[PDB]
Each structure stands twice: as structure tokens, then as C-alpha cells.
Symmetry: C4
Subunit: 321 residues, 4 copies
């Protein structure tokens, strides 16, 4: 049956799966004690200003008032009272017991200022709880690489192969693969390149490195005359000091951000003479992906143990002589 329904839907089911720009991530909760501190500080500073005004205006001795004396802010009889009035103005609770009167222009202007400072102070709380909220970093790896690489024979050509799989049902827009052999080398003119990176060809010049990754796929690398692996047999493999790196970039629909899945294979991790265990089976009227066979291989004794470079050289005599 269908692999892709007439509307894009993919017919597969997965199974058996296991300045202050640094403020955005200013911390985990050191930001919450930072804000709760921003409050306390402005609440105290203003509680102090109002207490100073109540001190000098002579209110502390006639907090309620007379027909002759009107306080700046009613009921500010001390600092705990001044502190509370301050809090009540900013939080905008304003219980009302402590209340500004129209007596001191200073107190009025102080209430006007604490209202703006207060509105600004928490318009930022929503801006920080916005950065540190709408922008994490531990995006769970949705892409998966086989544990080992395999060199076997496909369609008469000797290739290095490795698997890639989408752990999610979500797609990867404009996805492509890359590989490269990393080993230290000395140039002709005698020069030391510590860790030289050499491209491993997986299809770039024909666009074949562009993949449509629904169910897991096996990535191929034909080992030919132009390969940094051309002259490597199975024995050479259990001795060499090289490492192959594998990348899979693309646009991940889920995290909706351009991704770069990576992984590696040391010569000691690539299994020669093997093949991957299928993972896609058709359960009739729908396909399934037994994600348990993902890293599973299996011997193929009919696989040449010599290098691709020699495999070809020999072919000539048995065609020539």
C-alpha cells in the first residue's frame, strides 16, 4: 500500500523506542530571587521616603488628623506602617487604611513616581520570564545515528554505510547528509595539520545527499578511486588511527530551528563485512518501524576482505589476462 497518503500524511508507525543579553538565561531561579529582591528593594526605599515625609511633616504624632491638621498619607504612624503603605501602592492593592491625602505635593508626586517605577518593574518581569521561557537549550535530540558504520557490498560497489533515523513522527525539511574522515597528516612540503578534515563523498554533486527521512535510511559511501578509504582492507581497519564524522543538517519541524545532528565512528567502530538488519516491515495496510533493529547488523562472509583499491586492480587481470 501507500507510503505517503495523497495529502502528505506519512503511512508509518514507530515502535519499541526506549551586555545583559545573557540575562535571557540569567539562571534557573536565581532570577526569581532577583525579582523578588527587586520588589523588596523598591518597596523599602519608598517606604523610607514616605516615612521621612511623615517624620518631617509631623504626622507620626497625629496619624489620623484633626480639623486643623491633615497628614500627607493617613495612618503612617511608623516605619512598618510606612513600609506597608509603600507596598500597597506598588502592588496596587491599596487596602485603603493607609491613604494619600491631598496635602503634601511631595507625597502626591512620590505616589505618582512609585506607580510608574512599579509598572515598569513588572513589565520587565514578564519580559524576563519571557526570554528564559521562550528560548531553552536542551532540545531533545530527535535525530538518531546507528551505533556503528558498516562496509559491505551493494550493487557491485564497495561502500561504507551508516544509519540515520527520525525519532519523531515530525518531518525534517530540506535535510542533507555529510561525512568526513578526520586524521592528522603531514603535507608534501612537510607541514603539520593536527586534525585534518577530509570530505567523504555521499552524493553532493548529484544532490543525492538530500534526503527525505521518514523511516530510517542507510547512508551510502561508495569507496572509489577518489575516496580517502580507497586503499583500506579489513586488516588495515584493525590498525588505523582515523575517525569518520557524520553530520545530518536540516530544518526540524518540531524545534522549528535549523539542526545539525552529529556522531562518530573510529576505525575500531566500523564493522567490516556486515549489513544492517531491516527495520521497516509492512503489517499490511500500514508500515511499521521496529526501532529495536536500528543498530543491529549481521555478517556477510561473501564480502571481500581486501581494499577497494585492490579489488579493482585485480578485476583487470581477470578481464585482461
Amino acid at each position: 500500500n501507500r507510503f505517503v497518503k495523497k495529502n502528505g500524511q506519512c503511512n508509518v508507525e514507530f515502535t519499541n523506542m526506549d551586555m545583559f543579553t545573557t540575562c535571557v538565561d540569567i539562571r534557573w531561579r536565581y532570577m526569581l530571587l532577583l525579582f523578588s529582591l527587586a520588589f523588596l528593594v523598591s518597596w523599602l526605599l519608598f517606604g523610607l521616603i514616605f516615612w521621612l515625609i511623615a517624620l518631617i511633616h509631623g504626622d507620626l504624632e497625629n496619624p489620623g488628623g484633626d480639623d486643623t491638621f491633615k497628614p500627607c498619607v493617613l495612618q503612617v504612624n511608623g516605619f512598618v506602617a510606612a513600609f506597608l503603605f509603600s507596598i500597597e501602592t506598588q502592588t496596587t492593592i491599596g487596602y485603603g487604611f493607609r491613604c494619600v491625602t491631598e496635602e503634601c505635593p511631595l507625597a502626591v508626586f512620590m505616589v505618582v513616581v512609585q506607580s510608574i517605577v512599579g509598572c515598569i518593574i513588572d513589565s520587565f518581569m514578564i519580559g524576563a520570564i519571557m526570554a528564559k521561557m521562550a528560548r531553552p537549550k536542551k532540545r531533545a535530540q530527535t535525530l538518531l545515528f546507528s551505533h556503528n558504520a558498516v562496509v559491505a557490498m551493494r550493487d557491485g560497489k564497495l561502500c561504507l554505510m551508516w544509519r540515520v533515523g527520525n525519532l519523531r513522527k515530525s518531518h525534517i525539511v530540506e535535510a542533507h547528509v555529510r561525512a568526513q574522515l578526520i586524521k592528522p597528516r603531514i603535507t608534501e612540503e612537510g607541514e603539520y595539520i593536527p586534525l585534518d578534515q577530509i570530505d567523504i563523498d555521499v552524493g553532493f554533486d548529484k544532490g543525492l545527499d538530500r534526503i527525505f527521512l521518514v523511516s530510517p535510511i542507510t547512508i551510502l559511501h561508495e569507496i572509489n578511486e577518489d575516496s580517502p578509504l580507497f586503499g583500506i582492507s579489513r586488516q588495515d581497519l584493525e590498525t588505523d588511527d582515523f575517525e569518520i564524522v557524520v553530520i545530518l543538517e536540516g530544518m526540524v519541524e518540531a524545534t522549528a530551528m535549523t539542526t545539525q545532528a552529529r556522531s562518530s565512528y573510529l576505525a575500531s567502530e566500523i564493522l567490516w563485512g556486515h549489513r544492517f538488519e531491516p527495520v521497516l516491515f509492512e503489517e499490511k495496510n500500514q508500515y511499521k518501524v521496529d526501532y529495536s533493529h536500528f543498530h543491529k547488523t549481521y555478517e556477510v562472509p561473501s564480502t571481500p576482505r581486501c581494499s577497494a583499491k585492490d579489488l579493482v586492480e585485480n578485476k583487470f587481470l581477470l578481464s585482461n589476462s
Copy 2:
């Protein structure tokens, strides 16, 4: 007249169209009962703390006060009264009947704490109603694929064709197409590739797969020596077990996100010997797109019923012998 005005505007009119990172989409409205619950819980817990303080401080028996006794919070005569005071502090309504006094440092600090917890609690409500708001998933498909593929003859070459159309007036930035024949196959060395994906060439090596999709366009695939369709005649078509997948990626101006429109054609869905009904007509001084002829085809009996592989082989004798 003009197809593209001197300022980009396109001269066409369309007609007849039919951790908690999972919190972002934590639900539909199970989040609203989640918040309305976050409230109720903090309102009750604090109402309890204040009621405990009013219990131990001996206020429940003298809620208003004397010249000798001052409660921690005036008018907390019970738990419903304690509950209300709690609510009033956080919501910041503070009617004022229930009011903190400057007596118990504990009660003062409790009001200071409930104000911060409260401000934090709803700074997050705006952060969640922000994720689940500024990031959906049912983005309406703006791209459209013809219902069937067609194999006919254009400019002396035999090609597989299919249509694509932009359902919106909005453009698709950097848009390109891809196709690929999906069928199971056994390799030379005898190996089972369940669902092998084989690229169908639509112009990648010349950049011709890059499209400027205003009015619908017909995508062509010349069936040549290098095609996975090279040896398929019309009869073979009513028997084969293959499926062709079609992708159209690009940057959609509307959803302003990289898209991947898909679709499929089973051998049984591609109409041999046909051609698409035009959809673009010039109503003089402006072009129109009768989107009703989108999936409409029409027979072309002068179309070869043999495969492209044979069509070419024959050409030699009638040129040779």
C-alpha cells in the same frame, strides 16, 4: 500585459477555490483549569496561614480591635474571612475591609511573600498563554498538488508531469521541487531494501528545480536512459507496484516558516497519454487562474503507448535501416 508589475506586485487573480517543553502545547483548555487551579491553591494555602495567625494571636474573638488589642489583619473572624483576605491580597483588589495592621511581623512578611508569589504566578500565566498562543500546528496547507500525474509528450521528449499551485496570493521564497520512485528492491548481492527511495530527476543539476510559483505550474520529468521509469510502457503501468512521491519545499511568506508540501502517485494514479487543462487565461489587462481546471486532464491519442526505452531504440532503425 504584465505578469509582474515593476514593483513586485503579481498581476494574477485566483478564482473558484473550494522537560516541560511540552507545556507550550500542554493542552487545549486543560491549561486554563490548570491556572484557575494554581490560583485557588495559593489563595487557600495563604488563607490558611492567615487564619492560623489570627487563631494563635487571639484575633478571632476581637476582629476589630480595642485601644488595648490590635489584630494582625483586621476583620479576620473565621476561615471564609481569612480566605477572602488572602484572595484580596493576591488579586490585589484589597477591598479594604480585611486589612493588615502593623502588629505581627509575621503577618506583614506573609503579605510580602504572597505578593511576590502572586506576581510570579501570573507573569507565567502570560508566558503560557504565550507559548500555546504564538505557536500552533494545524497551519492550513497553502500548497496544492494535482490529483494525478500524467505521462505525455512535450517537445519531442517523453515526460512524467504533475501540477503544483499556491493556494494563496502570498509567495514562496526559495522554492524547489523533488520527486522519487518508491519501491522495494533486492540488490545484486541479494539484499532486501524494504522501501527503496530512488530520485526522480526534475532539474537539480541546472537549478531548474528552483521554481517561481505564482500561477500553478506543471512540473516535468523527462523519462530518459537515466530514469527509473525509462523502461515502462502504458501496459506495464497497469501492473507495476511502484509509487512516486512528490515534495515542494520552500519558505512560505504566510506561515513564515520553512515548508515541505508532499503528495503521492501510485502507478494506478498516473494517467498515461494525457495533458493538463490550462488554468491561466488572460482576461485582458490582468490574468486569471480558474482553479477549477487544476486537476483536469484530457486524452492525447497521438501519444506513444510504448516505453521511453523502446521509443528510442526504434528511432535508430528509422534513421539507420
Copy 3:
């Protein structure tokens, strides 16, 4: 001197320049009357509920209370009073004159519900004033195309040319150009392609279509054997029914979004035998771009009036015979 300082800075100065997913752009201000209406409605509905409770509980006749009778909400003596209490609870002003008492569990729960509905109602106001704010559509065109195309002779090759310029000092990341001749044509097998789009080659196979657009640049299109313009002389130009479209895609640093600048040239708009007036002059120790010469051309009478197809055919005899 330097065109690009050692740190990226570019040494040029410009002168003489002239479901409800549709809710995001739900309107201009029909959204503000939408919210101010959302308020009024919930304020009235609740004012009604509280007035109903005050009606049935018998408060309307004893709004203040006795030592024997306690209202649900003090001072609700009518509907205007009930309306106000409702408003005061949601806005969270709570002047205090109208105040909930701990008498009716219904009234308490009604205040609890109006507080949550109210907090939700305006957490959305910030979410809508967020969509319709952080996502417009009239992004001012920052890219500019010359008014006319020009066909002249450069380095011995006959080319079609047109200008492109960045109206801003900001750069265009990964910018590339494209052109294509749009004209209706009938295929060999006699088929009508209304508006056929034919790629005009500007350097894709060598990557030369990739541009680093600081000061304006002249885009070239060598008219060769492979051009849809190969057989067009100056006379043919004052008769043909073709139109050339020009695109310039890339990532615009300013609008930080993938862009697609467009434009067009009808045969009647491309000036044969011309050349663009320079726009870049070095005012010593800094470069300037007189953006007034942008669309200015100038005759070059030594320019062949015949087509590129003929220009080449002739070259043979005067090299041959």
C-alpha cells in the same frame, strides 16, 4: 582605500535617496473595540449575577446591614451599584465601599470566579496585542531594481544587464539572483503553455549568482547559444511580446526574514545599446554611492544592432573566408 574594514564594517556612505489564526491580524482597531467589549460584557454579566443575589438575599432593602442582617456584598443597593461592584472586582480596583462579606458562599465563589475569568481575559489581551504587534506585513522594500534593463557589450560578450541595490546599510545574508523570460508558447506536439517561464542564466552553475551586495551591482546575462535571447536584434526588440522577470532572494538582516525582491522588464523597457551611469565614487578615505544615478543610462553607438546569434555567425567568415 578599504572597501571592508578588518572587522566587517563596510566603508560606504549612501546619498541622495528619495481557525482564529487570522486573529493575529484580526484587524486594525476592531480588536480594541473587541476587547473593550469583552470587558463590558463580563462586567455586566457579573454585575447581573451579584444583583440577582442581592435581590434574592434581600439586601436591596438593607444594603449596609444590622446586628441581625449581613448582606452578601455590602452596599449593593441597585444595579448601578451591582454593576460597579462587578467592575471593581475584575479591574481589581476594589475601592472598598462595595465589599463582599463572608455571608453567602455563592457570592464568595462568584468573586473567586470573576477573578479568574478576569485574569484570563486580559492575559489574552496581552497575547493579541502581541500577535498584531510582533508580526506586521508592510515591511518597507529594502531592495531596489533599476528601472530598465540594458543590452550592451562587456568583455567581448553581448549581455542583458540590470541593476540591484540595497537601500539600507544593513546586509543581505546568502543573497542570490535569478531571471527568467516569460512568454506564451506552443509546444512541438502542439500544446498551449499560457505563460511559459524560461530561465535566464545569470551564473548558477558556477555559483556566480551568489552576490555580496554592498554598493549597487550590475547583474549580467551573457546572451549565448543557450539563451532564450540568442536570436534577438535591436529591431526585433521593438516588436516582441516577451517579458523578463527578475528576482533577488536572500536573508535580510533588518526584517530578519527570508526575502524575495521582484521586478520586471517588458521588451519595450530594456534599452539596447546602453550602459549604466556609475554610482560608486571614491571621495578619498571612504566610498560614496550617489543613488541618483541608479537608473541612469547612456548610449554606446559602437554597440552591435544585430542579434547575438548573428553576431557570432558572421565572426566565422571573417576568420574563415
Copy 4:
């Protein structure tokens, strides 16, 4: 050991490192005095409306009320009192001393209007402190270019080289390089191209310009027959008027935005006959990058002082004659 752990983690340690759309960036803090002004203005205008109502309704002479006279808003005895009531309604503090009564439908409707205007006014404060917060411009350069370019001999080919390094541990998704020689030139038909940009080949046609930039990398440019540097010897270098520009675009994981790192090299800045000092050393069981040797070169006297064009011409005689 490993350069890339089996899960993507990279085994390297760095050391020794030194309309109103313009409102988004409407300013630094001229926006805060803009808002604090938006407040003051609406607070004053409404304080005026309420004072006008209290004037005409005759309240200023009976602010508290009688059993015969009920004010529109209790306690508005002047403009400072009217001003305060206004502030208290919008901020939603509502101390309660100044309170609306159900007498004047006008005053009620005025409180209803100031509540909506007020809620709108600061829903925007969160929208502006959102633009100017979640979108800066001084993104710290994370990419680094060597101070000088070097022309030396690698693997028998004469190349122009320069270094690039990631100043962060974070990766660069889909990263590629570009270079181009910028010099003024006069065309064959005699035409003045002020500052002509000529591509310097760094591997585009094989995809070798695509880099996986972990530890710093040396970018190569083989100077061959096709190079705009083919005919330049060391002497010519201390005379020429050319400048080479270098770009490194890619997707930077940190700023999560498409980047374009730039830099330049005047003929006088490219050191002939040199080589870069290594920067990658293996401290056993982990690699290190001594970022202090980044711009450090060193003479290689065995380096040809003649141009690549001549170096090749000579090779013929000593192979020929």
C-alpha cells in the same frame, strides 16, 4: 582519541581568549520617559474630566454628602483630589477614600472608559518592552578571521590561505565560505567598473566550501590558471592595488539567526612565503585550542617568490627540454 563523541559532543577545549516599526528600537530609555509620560497625560486628562463633573454637579462644596445630596465621586474636593482619584482608578490601586457613587451615569461611564484605556495603555507597555527587549543588534561577533592571509605551498599547489575560528563552543549550522578580489577595472570595450568584485575560488563546485568549524580551520585557495591571482609574484604583491574580501555565512546556534562574518586583506596584508602556527594540540584524552597562536605565522624560505603563472610555465621546460 575522539574529536566527536558518539553523541555529537565535541571533544575540544578553548583557551587563552582575550510606520512605527522603528518603535521596536524607538530608543534606549526615551521610551521609558515616553510611557511614564503616557501615564501622566491620561491621569491628568481624566483627573480633569472628573474635576469638571465634580465642579458642575456641585460636589466641591459637599464632598462627603448628606441624606439629601450624593456626589458623583466621594471626596473630590479639588483638582489634586480629582487628580488622585483619576490615578487610583487606572493604576487600580483604589485606596477607597475617593470613591465613585452610583449617582452620575456620566461619572460611572467615565470610570468604565478609564479602565479600558488604562488596561490598553499598559498592555502596550508590555508589547514595547517586548520588542526593544527580544530583538537587539549588537550581537557579539562569535566568528573570527586571522589578521593576515598567507600564500604558501601545500601539496604541490600554490595557495592563498586565511584562518577562521568559532569563538564559541556552540556550532555553526550549514556553514560555508566565500572570498573575492575587489579592484577597479576597465572593460575591453572601455568601461569603468569602479569597484569590481571577482570571485576567489574556495571549493564551491565540489561543495568543499561547506565547513564543519569546530577548532579553527585554514581556508585554502589554489592559485591556478583560473585565479584572479594567477599572475602575481611576491614582488608584484608589494605594489598592487587589490583587496581580498572574505565571508563566512552560516546558521549560528547561539544568536539563532543566519550570520555573515566578514573581513579583508589588502595586498599589503597578505604575507607571502608564510604558514600559520598550529593551534590544535592533543593534551591526551581531550584536544585543546591555544587561541593565542591564531594569528601567528612563520617564514618558509623554500617558498617560490615567483607567480603561480610562471611557476607552471617553467615546469614545462624541466619536463620538456
